[PDB]
Symmetry: C3
Subunit: 154 residues, 3 copies
């Protein structure tokens, strides 16, 4: 009976959907995702901010955004090098916004940062933000190439 075959096939599909969910949980776990916390991951490739945005979007994620000390340390450890954060004041100078919307709240600026430097020689000031090796932040040219770190929901 076609109905029986259809029913058995629906069961197979459900089994596969659960298997894939497990595959995703195992991968996240293997990559360091902590229980109930956002998942941060990188391919260790350095690229301009525009590229990071496109890459994370393709993966259905967003550019890493630290919203507290814990998340900051987590991203720092993942990146292990200067990486772009999803924060920018491209629109209005001095008004840093999350790529996901909203004005900047938590921050971990290095002393004297942000300074919107123009002397880097790339044109424009510094409208992007990078978390440096020590975990502190520094505004940088969005044209510069820093590590791509994407984040996925908790």
């Amino acid at each position: 009976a076609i109905e029986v075959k259809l029913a058995n096939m629906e069961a197979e599909i459900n089994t596969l959907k659960s298997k894939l969910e497990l595959t995703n949980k195992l991968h996240a776990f293997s990559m360091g995702k902590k229980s109930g916390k956002k998942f941060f991951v990188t391919n260790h490739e350095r690229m301009p901010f525009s590229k990071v945005k496109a890459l994370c979007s393709e993966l259905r994620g967003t550019v890493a955004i630290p919203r507290n000390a814990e998340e900051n340390k987590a991203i720092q450890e993942v990146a292990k090098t200067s990486a772009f954060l999803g924060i920018t004041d491209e629109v209005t100078e001095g008004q840093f916004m999350y790529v996901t919307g909203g004005r900047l709240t938590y921050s971990n600026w290095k002393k004297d940062q942000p300074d919107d430097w123009y002397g880097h020689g790339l044109g424009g000031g510094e409208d992007c933000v990078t978390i440096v090796d020590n975990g502190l932040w520094n505004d940088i040219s969005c044209q510069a190439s820093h590590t791509a770190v994407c984040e996925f929901p908790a």
Copy 2:
């Protein structure tokens, strides 16, 4: 049409099964799984034994258990810090057993361990086991938080 469509769906489902199996194989390989050998994975999160057990269970794995010096070495390599092992004397004080059942066939106890110590203030003695930095074992409170290391079959 209906029957031809249903027949294609079977092929679609079968093909997806094979692709997901291949995905799992590649993932195990990327996580360092050696041919015909079980493998260990961690997200580097520290939590109480009960949480590790539930977490590994959810991944269809088990809390890491060393059956020989090689596996013990592999687990410490994966963990990097003190991690719980799937061995406890919760059923009968003094008699350590595998969470998977049965008595120990291999041990690597640290000198003067196990000691079922109470001075840790967590209440009760020590019924769980952790592999320490240098591969040796120590019994610790199951309430204590140590690294979660899951094991997957060979």
Copy 3:
């Protein structure tokens, strides 16, 4: 009812295909795949050449093959020790060919190599090639055990 169910099943299968593709993209990213570049992966296990071939084949990949300095560097960094490349002169002594077919177009041989040395006592000369610690190449016995590094398309 039957046709609506078949239509939903087609939709379920397509969503599953879509999610698996996303899972594969995320996995490659997490394993260091650089944008538009072929990627190399290893489980850090050492084995004879025939085993590496069988293994990478099972993963629907191929034994790593550098076609230029950049790829050679990438493989070197992934393996971090001597590893077999998909290059051999088994078909015609002295003529190194890619396992994927065709004569070498890029080479990075160490000084005095290849030498089809017999002194290893394994039998036969040296018909396989490994990339050594510094990125240079040496022909070695296909029967020797070196790191398995698989390659997947860009």
